[PDB]
């Protein structure tokens, strides 16, 4: 039940090869649901499933 700055939700956390912009925080797909979140302390790209 991850909570990355207010985002309550369930899903696995794994490192992903994606690369955000420095200001970009969140990842969304064509269906407008979260699938990529950046860690607010150790800035990294994680995949949500």
């Amino acid at each position: 039940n991850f909570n990355f700055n207010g985002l309550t939700g369930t899903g696995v956390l794994t490192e992903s090869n994606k690369k955000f912009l420095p200001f970009q925080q969140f990842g969304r797909d064509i269906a407008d649901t979260t699938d990529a979140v950046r860690d607010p302390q150790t800035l990294e790209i994680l995949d949500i499933t």
């Binding site: 899903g11 269906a31 649901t33 699938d35 499933t49």
Partner: peptide, 30 residues
């Protein structure tokens, strides 16, 4: 495999075996 409950059930007849049915359908008429 989608996020919000939506699951896609694969077809009973896979793409490989239906190809075998087709080849059977061709084979008889040829």
């Amino acid at each position: 495999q989608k996020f919000n409950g939506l699951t896609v059930l694969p077809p009973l007849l896979t793409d490989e075996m239906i190809a075998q049915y087709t080849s059977a359908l061709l084979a008889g008429t040829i």
